[PDB]
Amino acid sequence: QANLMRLKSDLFNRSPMYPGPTKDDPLTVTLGFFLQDIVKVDSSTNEVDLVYYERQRWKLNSLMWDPNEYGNITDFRTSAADIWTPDITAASSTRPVQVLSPQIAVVTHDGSVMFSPAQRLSFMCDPTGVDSEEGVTCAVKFESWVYSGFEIDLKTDTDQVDLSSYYASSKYEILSATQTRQVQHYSCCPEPYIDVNLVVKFRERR
Amino acid sequence: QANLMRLKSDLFNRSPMYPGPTKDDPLTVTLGFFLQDIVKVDSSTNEVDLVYYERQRWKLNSLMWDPNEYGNITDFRTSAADIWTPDITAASSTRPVQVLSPQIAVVTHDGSVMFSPAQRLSFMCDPTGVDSEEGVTCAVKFESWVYSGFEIDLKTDTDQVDLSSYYASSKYEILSATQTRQVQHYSCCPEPYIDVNLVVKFRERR
Amino acid sequence: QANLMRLKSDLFNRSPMYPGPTKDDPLTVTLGFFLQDIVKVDSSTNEVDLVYYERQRWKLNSLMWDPNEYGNITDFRTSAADIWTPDITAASSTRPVQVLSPQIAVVTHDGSVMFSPAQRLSFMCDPTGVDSEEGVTCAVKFESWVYSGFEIDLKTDTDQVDLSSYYASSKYEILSATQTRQVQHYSCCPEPYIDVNLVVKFRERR
Amino acid sequence: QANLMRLKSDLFNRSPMYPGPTKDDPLTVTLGFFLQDIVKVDSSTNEVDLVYYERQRWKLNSLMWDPNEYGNITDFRTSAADIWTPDITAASSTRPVQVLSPQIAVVTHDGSVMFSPAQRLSFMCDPTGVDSEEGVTCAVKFESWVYSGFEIDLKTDTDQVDLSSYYASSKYEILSATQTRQVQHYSCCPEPYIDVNLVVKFRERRANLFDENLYFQHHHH
Amino acid sequence: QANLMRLKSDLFNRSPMYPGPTKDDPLTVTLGFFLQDIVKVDSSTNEVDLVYYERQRWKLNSLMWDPNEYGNITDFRTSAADIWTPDITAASSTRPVQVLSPQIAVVTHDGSVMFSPAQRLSFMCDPTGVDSEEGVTCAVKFESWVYSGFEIDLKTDTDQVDLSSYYASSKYEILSATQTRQVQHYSCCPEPYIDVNLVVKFRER
Ligand SMILES: CN1[C@@H]2CC[C@H]1C[C@@H](OC(=O)c1c[nH]c3ccccc13)C2
Ligand SMILES: *[C@@H]1O[C@H](CO)[C@@H](O)[C@H](O)[C@H]1NC(C)=O
């Protein structure tokens, strides 16, 4: 307890919180998705509901410590309210995201942070064709709402969405699921914006 | 980090929050809308549901700094709770607005602030005629709930609503969308009342 | 800004909050309703849903100032959390009231406060007869939940509910709308208890 | 104002909050219910929805004062967050209770507190038979979630639920409504557990003087 | 009151909060479920809704006291916000869990804590076959979201779910209900992850 209390106190009570990235000190956040269930489809509104979790990973110099100074502690868990977290947003949501997991992150001695929120999301998707065998494809972009690619860069570790927690008796079967970094220009703005595009092809289960 | 922490501390911890505008020190807030989706229509209640975001822009002397004094930082992101924000309200909503984006603003060295909330709104609209080819027109006014035009003046940069993120497979197709400043004067009251009128003509997609 | 910051600091940071009215220092609160829409009727549950706003007005000696001492400021806006507000409650609601407007009040140099919350309310109402031409009458009382008439007296400025923001294409048409002070006496207790009874006669629009 | 500010400051800012009752310093809470409306019935889920308020009353030595020391103040209103309140819970709810009234209590100079929250509750009830003339009976127990009868004793002032605010045009008509203290014993445990059982018999119903004075027998103290 | 106020002040205001378990100071949390009602089934979405409460139990050295020093107090009740609590999560929920009970725990002089939240849960379950006599089986895992088995170990006191508060007039009848500790290993990662699997077989009454 004592060593950990002391570490948390040195990292959090001895200087102000990390104020977020800038042009001069940009930050890279890695995302990966873990699909759990397509819960429903609404063909009268073109909304589809997904349950998933999302691994977010980034690294801050101000969260580093030497384990020899703190009883060989190499990592700890802490409330997400204690640290900065990136403002990753689904760009085509139609309802506020519902949080299904505790807001807690893992911080490691090299300054890396891992945060894995689970979420239910409603997003814009025309499910016409879902009852066929070819199925239907939908997409949703995830991006920083307020930071450009000059401040936050996104990436993936893999292009394949992990389906190993996908609910075997879902009403919908996943044909494919990818997650792809894109660098986007908009007409408003010279700065690039980075997103991760989640593309899911699915159909009604046999 | 250090320069930014120092700037945030100088702007926010060294004086009280901006107490809002008055008759003598009025403020101009610029709005623009970015329609993303008409999600549904309810002809039994005369409610229509819209997903959009809204750019809000204003400028405060108390948020100015010289970038040479702060390592050449020209802008930063910060939680909307750290600053004053205007109380722009949809006058004909029928439900609390659902927030779809992080509550974060961009503050620039000239004291200008940009806040871009994304929202789902239910508002009063008779959708009779939507299945026709002429479609239907609905309107919603946006105004300060408690500040008159002597304290907050609202403006638009353009009269055309941005439709470049409108969902291509929405059930509803946008025929036109405008956003127009209106100034009202009433016999009861010396104060002008300002609103921005969002007028949208739409119909069922072919 | 500076004069206003100073006024707010003198009124709010230099003494404890007004602890509410007593027998010895009673208060009068004036209410008026502004009906905007009867959104729906549910004849299987006898609930009706109304959207409206409510003007509340009262006066405190502790909110007085001399404008000459504060740069001629005669009024300001402030968050309702900064001040005491009366606990006016709809006695026959069936759901928590949904707030549609920012919780901000206007305070004037004579100590008077104006607070105008907009609300969606579900309340107990048998809509049988609404499809007829005579329509149907429903009523809802608004009262202080915990203060007697010795501490808070309610009144209206007029007995006519204002209908000038009523939605012209509502499914329901207002035939009449009144707001009337009533005094309730309990045999146990000398104190009167006050309510304002909102009585609305309405029917389906032609 | 000044005397009241001073009283609130002496009662709340000068010592820690009452930490709740114990075996050695137990407390009695008195409940009564005031049924307002059976709003609906769901026969596909066996849930029924009620709107009511609930008078709760208890007394603490730490909330006592002498009115002569405080300008003859005998009572005041205050936010429920300023005081300890009992954790009375509906044992068979199926949704979080929705609060319909401001969270404010009346505290009196003898240390007694009166708190009257209004609530919408969904609870477990098979409504089969509601469309008949015999109607249907549902029950829900209200109890302390964590305190035994050694720490909190519950009681009622009357066994009859007050129906004077019951909505006359509800879809459902009340045949009877009682509220009854019960003592529950479990074989594991010496401590009694107290509840108040709200029993309502009702059925589907079959189917002007808005006057400036109204007379009653202050329910929502 | 006085002795209790003093105890609470010594345990909570005189040192920082317990920062949670580590590899070096792990913790065991014991769970048991008390099913109250299967409220509904949705066969178009494969979601089922359960109402239950959950007994959680663990023990901290930092919550110990000697009753002789505090007027013979052996236990007290306190708001769950005053203490660390484990981040036990239903892994296959489809909506945020709705809390039905006050967030209050019992702390005992040996440092043990008992916390019993009541909850409504929507979770992933195919109810096909529920109208038959064999009924249908569904399952939901409960686990620490962020702590591995090196930091938090879960266990049960019994493998039988307690059904003594089950609603006699539910639309659904419980055929069986078990709760079982499981250890999960992933090939990427050396640390085990622990869950308690709640398995419920039920049918229309
Ligand atoms: C994540 N999204 C990216 C960046 C913010 C959010 C919404 C989109 O931005 C804009 O519309 C504008 C940005 N800057 C502007 C300037 C003038 C007009 C529009 C914008 C794209
Ligand atoms: C106050 O009013 C006087 C008289 O009109 C005026 O001269 C003065 O400028 C006002 N004060 C301020 C700070 O505006």
Residue numbers in the entry:
A (entry chain D), B (entry chain E), C (entry chain A): 20 to 225
D (entry chain B): 20 to 226, 233 to 242, 246 to 249
E (entry chain C): 20 to 224
What does the paper say about this structure?
Protein-engineering methods have been exploited to produce a surrogate system for the extracellular neurotransmitter-binding site of a heteromeric human ligand-gated ion channel, the glycine receptor. Acetylcholine-binding protein is a highly conserved ortholog of the pLGIC extracellular ligand-binding domain (ECD) with properties similar to nAChR. Mutations affecting key residues in the orthosteric agonist site at the α1(−)/β(+) interface affect the potency of both activation by glycine and inhibition by strychnine. We therefore set out to generate a high-fidelity surrogate of this α1(−)/β(+) orthosteric binding site using the 2α1:3β stoich­iometry [Fig. 1(a)] by exploiting protein-engineering methods and the thermal stability of acetylcholine-binding protein from Aplysia californica (AcAChBP). Ultimately, the highly stable AcAChBP framework has allowed us to introduce nine amino-acid substitutions that have resulted in a stable surrogate for a heteromeric neurotransmitter site that binds glycine.
Variant II therefore reverted back to Trp164, but with the inclusion of a G162E substitution. Crystal structures of variant II with HEPES, tropisetron and strychnine revealed that the G162E substitution was accommodated with the structure essentially unperturbed compared with variant I, although now incorporating two charged residues (Arg74 and Glu162) to polarize the binding site such that the principal side is negatively charged and the complementary side is positive. The complex structure with HEPES showed this crystallization buffer component binding in two orientations in the orthosteric site in a similar fashion to that reported for LsAChBP. The variant II complex showed tropisetron [Fig. 3(a)] to be present in two of the ten orthosteric sites in the asymmetric unit, with the other sites being occupied by the cryoprotectant ethane-1,2-diol and the N-terminal histidine tails of symmetry-related molecules. The second pose is influenced by the Y110A and G162E substitutions, which allow a solvent-bridged interaction between the glutamate and tropisetron N1. van der Waals interactions between the tropane and aromatic residues are maintained in both poses with minor adjustments of side chains. The T53F substitution and the placement of the aromatic group help to place the arginine from the Q74R substitution to participate in a cation–π stacking arrangement of the guanidinyl moiety and the indole system, pushing tropisetron over towards the disulfide linkage on loop C. A solvent-mediated link between Ser135 and Arg74 may also contribute to the placement of the guanidinyl moiety. The indole N10 is directed out towards bulk solvent, whilst the carbonyl group accepts a hydrogen bond donated from the side chain of Tyr72.
